[model samples]
Target: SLAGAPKYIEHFSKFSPSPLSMKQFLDFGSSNACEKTSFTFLRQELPVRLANIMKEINLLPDRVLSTPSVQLVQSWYVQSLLDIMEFLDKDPEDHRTLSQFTDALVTIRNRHNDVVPTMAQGVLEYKDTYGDDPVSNQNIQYFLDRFYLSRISIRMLINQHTLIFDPAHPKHIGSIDPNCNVSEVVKDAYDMAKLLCDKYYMASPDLEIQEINAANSKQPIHMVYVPSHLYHMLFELFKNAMRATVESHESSLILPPIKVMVALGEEDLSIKMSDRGGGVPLRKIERLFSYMYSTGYGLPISRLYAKYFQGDLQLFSMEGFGTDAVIYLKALSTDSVERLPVYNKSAWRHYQTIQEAGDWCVP
Candidate 1:
């Protein structure tokens, strides 16, 4: 009867090259689904197990532990594990089974290392990149948490694969593609935020007249791309713009409103942050792509990361005008893309070929 389970029977019939008896096929399908269903059930129950542990320690019902957020975060973790396992399945060198998975888990247990420290280090690094700006801190923390969860999920996937291939020797997991350099990506994001912040300081004094004239002329003199590192970037950019507008009104008794356009692209899964701060400076536009020739400190890093991921970064600035930065990177992909070419072979290469070809004067 167990052999005749519908799920396993279907699996057997579909995977088997040779034809099978109707009863045999049904039985096989049932058996396979039964196993899969059991695993699925267990996977779903993992969060509950974690929840129980927390509850036992009197930590289950914290504000941050809202049911929806918990479930969503947990799901992301689980999905990450599944994704990595899928990748491992395609590897020619490894054919992992359930027993191997158990062994790897055991090994990990013996290692008894706390991955949280690494995650915390990442958070601290993120904070440093933003120069401890209030806005930067908020966004940095949010993204850092996400990154940590993703990392944990990755480890979980590895552990699961080890379980699957328990009897076999553990195959070394390959390093991530250079193109997917997480550190560089986060750093660049922070730098972009800093540049925007500096620009905001420069532009705030003339906010009111600029707004009024733009409204009358129906033309924006300056525009800038709000940073994309986190929600805080937006908050800071807006706050700075508003401050400038108010300050201009106070100083010159003029009221000029800054115009901004915010659009989220679903297909690209990218957010477009543009503001009419002024326009890009004319002389700088030509060398915008040149490294070390940034109008702001952050552009160089942001540019590097964008190119590392085969993404695009565009800047438009005019003298006596404003500047706009556009960053485009691939949305989260279920399947990994070919790693972008690294700029350098030896030195913690982050950006890919695009950055390498660009003249990046370190000075």
Candidate 2:
């Protein structure tokens, strides 16, 4: 059986399949890790966000409205509502809400050709007729949470298969070996963020890498980390660090550079990143992690990401000098990427954790 596991990976690698297809292959991947029996995490947020940009016509007005891609996606948004309407028809209250949104999108597409082209000109493309619930608003069901759960889940399973089996993704998160290093991932992101300095403005800053707690830190200090996850969190931290440090100093000179120290310990690995740039102006530090502040997507999710693995993220600021972000992650070998949702103590405390639920197939 061990001899054929790679064969299994090799077979599945050829086709880019949906979760349904992948599920058929994964012996029912860990969909039972949550507690929702019904439709639990859908809403008007996506449609509203899409409409906001479409009506603005950020590109040449007519040019964007006429494209097959644009027209097709608009129809798909309308279809999501219709599917919700049909499935929850027995619950008239939920049906009406969905119908209202569906009718509104159709009315915009059909009658308001000047604003958004109607069915008369747009393509009638197939769309997501499933996996949505308007009343589903658990904290873990947020798009960000649902998505990473799905991605990390699959990445680990497939990588697990490859180690014992075989796989074919051109580039992937290698197995979470004890030697996975994130310095490269962080440096790559910092370099990209500083491209303007390297090319346009012709300026940059110093980046110092130091390794402490070195029993084996000298000997390729790495640990049980899904590199992409660690890379994703660290790179964004570096991006934030670089953004601050670069803006605080003169373009021609680079010194007192951003400092990154990697500490390898017996039980866990620690990363401390310091930026000499100014600290955040907001006293409510949580606001830095909120997506509404133009903070980009990574930092908002990075904190949640670190916690998903039982690790912790801490930030300490010095009034005017700079900021420190410290990360600690467990260094153990396991085939599990355990994550449980955290919820407020109000209405849905009973539905608080995603520890035990049903299958979630986002095809």
Candidate 3:
């Protein structure tokens, strides 16, 4: 395999449970205007996207394309399209069908995750022989990077909403507030974090919010944001902080509090989660950003949500003291609600620094 084969394989090996049935999947829609819009885009766009990726797979050498892992993923794509098209023809607005759509999306993601190692391996060998030629880059980029995740993230973002909006689902999370009460979202997430921390490690820590805004100086501030995205991001940061801080302290010693300071800006808001957890070594900090990295499930996915709206997630650490995770997110975005992963391009913004002047701002 190319240089990234084992790394790629490790990346592909991922999971989650709570398997929804195809029939149950048919019933997960909420009938909101946004949900309908997302559904329409998914149905119209997904079939074409599936066909395109499958055809790309067919272009591979028969020896590789014909393998069990690749062929299995290929079949799932073809089959999922058929099921979705059938649902669309019969009952366009049915929640049942919507659930099916989500199920198909899940299958597509799992299948792709299963197949990535093979595809990556094949592409790596191809690259070793051919180098960074057009065909080599396209092989890795088009078929792998942009293949499943581009589609998954594009669909999952909306799928997240659909599931939340589903009225009768057991875990229905309710509405996603566009004009989000950022403070409340953080508090609620910290509450969840507290529960998980207690259950996981019997540690409870204070999470205080320090809000900064002219609006808040006179009155409480409610930001314009996708509430679910904010909740997920903050939840991850809190979980990390709670776990680390708890571990850092002795069972007899009370754990230090974790502080969340939020600043609201005209364009976006920035949040810093500061904790007294033992900091990660500087050398290992970079590992946490790798594609195969995680404190849990898959962290980059949330980071992707941040980047999707011209925002970012960052980590700062002191070797003997603590860590701060700084997250930035748009208070309101002019960008489209849902943009899929794109053809083999980096998702995070890239920048370089140079000190030509005494002033560091000028590159």
Q: Which candidate is the best by TM-score?
A: 3
lDDT, candidate 2, 5-34, per-residue tens: 223223322322222212122232223221
TM-score of 2: 0.50
The 10-residue segment of model 3 with minimum total lDDT is 343-352
Residue 338, model 3, lDDT: 37
Q: Tell me the spans in candidate 2 whose CA falls farther than 4 Å from its real position.
A: 1-178, 182-186, 196-201, 214-218, 281-284, 334-337, 342-347, 350-363
Global lDDT scores for all candidate models: 0.34, 0.47, 0.59
Which regions of candidate 3 deviate over 4 angstroms?
Answer: 1-41, 48-75, 84-152, 156-175, 214-216, 291-295, 335-339, 344-363
RMSD to native, candidate 1: 19.2
Tens-digit lDDT track of model 1 for 145-235: 2333333333433343333333222222221221233223333543454456447544332211112222334432221111233223333
- How many Å off is the CA of 50 in candidate 3? 3.9
Model 2 residue 35 CA deviation (Å) reads 27
lDDT of candidate 3 over 101-182, digit per residue (tens): 6666666555555454554454444444444343334243334434544444435443554455434334333333444677
Native-vs-model 3 lDDT? Answer: 0.59
**Model 2: colliding residue pairs:** 6-165, 6-166, 34-356, 34-357, 35-357, 40-136, 109-118, 178-222, 178-223
Query: In model 2, how large is the Cα lDDT of residue 296?
Result: 50
TM-score of each: 0.29, 0.50, 0.61
Q: lDDT score of model 1?
A: 0.34
Q: How many clashing pairs in candidate 2?
A: 9
Task: For residue 151, give model 1's deviation from the true position in Å.
Answer: 17
